[PDB]
Amino acid sequence: GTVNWSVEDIVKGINSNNLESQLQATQAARKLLSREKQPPIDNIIRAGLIPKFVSFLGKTDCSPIQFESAWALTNIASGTSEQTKAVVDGGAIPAFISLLASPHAHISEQAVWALGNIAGDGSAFRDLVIKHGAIDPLLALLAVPDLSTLACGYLRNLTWTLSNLCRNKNPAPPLDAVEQILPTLVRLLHHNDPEVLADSCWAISYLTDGPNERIEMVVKKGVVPQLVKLLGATELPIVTPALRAIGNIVTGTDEQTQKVIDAGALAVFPSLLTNPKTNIQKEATWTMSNITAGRQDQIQQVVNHGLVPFLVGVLSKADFKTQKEAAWAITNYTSGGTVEQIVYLVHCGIIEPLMNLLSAKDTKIIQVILDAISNIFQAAEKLGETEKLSIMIEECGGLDKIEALQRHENESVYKASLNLIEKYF
Amino acid sequence: RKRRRH
Amino acid sequence: TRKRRR
């Protein structure tokens, strides 16, 4: 019937003044644009069919053509930025926002999907969708006593579109829009569907990726305990965005980091720092590095949770990027920690892996490791045990690495190695 | 990101 | 600060 039409036939049908022929041609276009391989989006655009689809979006008396044109425009807007721009230039944003209130659930769902693609293009189209007033009807769609009454796919599409309205920076979403959306985001973060939870966590991670004021807007809503609970989930698609958000939050003030700590997040890091997924380990180690850059009582809470041995383990064996994040964590620990905490770190066996990592080609990790070594040496001096630390570094083959680093291209590494050797070796 | 309906 | 954002 409407399978495998040519663009010529689709154009001939849509250009007829027969609404049923137009509907059949629009469905043929939808089916063409829904094929797995090489959807002819550019050909459909060159034929000048976007204005006709946008006009069909407004035929309240023919809901089937509304649905077919909405699906076709959704698939066009899912492509490159130029194709999404073609959809937007056809005037599709206000038409989709009007369809959001359609009495037909599938048409409203398709409008949500299309707006999600458009907003997901980038900050400009995100803010333009917001200016046309999409947030109010979108949130009204979710104004129900219990989210479980809504169709699953419908709720998933709504959550994903809301996440795209929270996405992207330079600039970040409008503050009034973020405040308008956050309550519903919290409610969705307490929903039970794995995909809804994943997309809500992604939205929260987008919102927490910014200055301290954005992080504060998020944490004021009291979502940190739920974020930690989800950090403990078994589905990796949930743990990933939840860990993302928790790390973002700990990049802020010491009080926000303390909110993360009080929620019990540290107790999850034994698993996260040993997680089979390399990305989880890297994100967890970066989060730990930002937590060790906090107050001394926060470093002490890291110690009490037994996480220093896990940092030693990550430093000893892991992907190189995770090892670099662990080196950063150790350097922050030593810069902010007390003498007792630093000597405890030494007692856990940090010297040997920290020295083995000095054979890396990355210059920044060398600088970080040398700074950590200098801080540990300052602590030892404060205790008068600098000779013990010197022999400890010599026994694991570290003094040779430092002497070799004296002859390094970078000036900072040169000077740091020279100073270490002249002052302690 | 974007999603195409198949 | 020693804190590092992404």
Numbering used by the authors:
A (entry chain A): 72 to 496
B (entry chain C): 31 to 36
C (entry chain D): 30 to 35
What did the paper state?
The MERS-CoV ORF4b protein is a viral accessory protein that functions as an innate immune inhibitor and strongly localizes to the nucleus, despite virus replication occurring exclusively within the cytoplasmic compartment. The MERS-CoV ORF4b protein has been shown to bind preferentially to the nuclear import adapter IMPα3 in infected cells, thereby inhibiting NF-κB-dependent innate immune responses. Here we provide a detailed, structural basis for the interaction between MERS-CoV ORF4b and its innate immune suppression target, the nuclear import adapter IMPα. Our results provide a detailed structural basis that explains how a virus can target the IMPα nuclear import adapter to impair immunity, and illustrate how small mutations in ORF4b, like those found in closely related coronaviruses such as HKU5, change the IMPα binding mechanism.
Because HKU5 ORF4b had been studied previously and shown to traffic to the nucleus, and an analysis of the two NLS domains between the two viruses revealed only minor differences, we examined how differences could potentially result in changes in the mode of IMPα binding. Accordingly, we crystallized IMPα2 in complex with HKU5 ORF4b and found that, rather than utilizing the Arg/Val binding register motif of MERS-CoV ORF4b, HKU5 ORF4b bound IMPα2 using the canonical Lys P2 site. The NLS site also shifted, with HKU5 binding at the major and minor sites with the same sequence, RKRRRHP37. The equivalent sequence in MERS-CoV ORF4b, RKRSHSP28, lacks two Arg residues. C Cartoon representation highlighting the minor and major site interactions within MERS ORF4b and HKU5 ORF4b binding to IMPα2. D Crystal structure of HKU5 ORF4b bound to IMPα2 at 2.2 Å resolution and a comparison of MERS ORF4b bound to IMPα2 as per Fig. 1E. In this regard, we have examined the binding mechanism of the HKU5 ORF4b NLS bound to IMPα, which indeed uses a canonical Lys P2 binding mechanism. Our data confirms the results from an earlier study which demonstrated that downstream “site 2” basic residues are unimportant for HKU5 ORF4b nuclear localization. Indeed, despite the complete conservation of the downstream KRR motif among merbecovirus ORF4b proteins, these are not utilized for HKU5 ORF4b interactions with IMPα2; rather the functional NLS comprises the mono-partite sequence 31RKRRR35 which was capable of binding at both the major and minor sites on IMPα. Intriguingly, this monopartite “site 1”-only NLS has been shown to still be sufficient for the inhibition of NF-κB-mediated innate immune signaling.
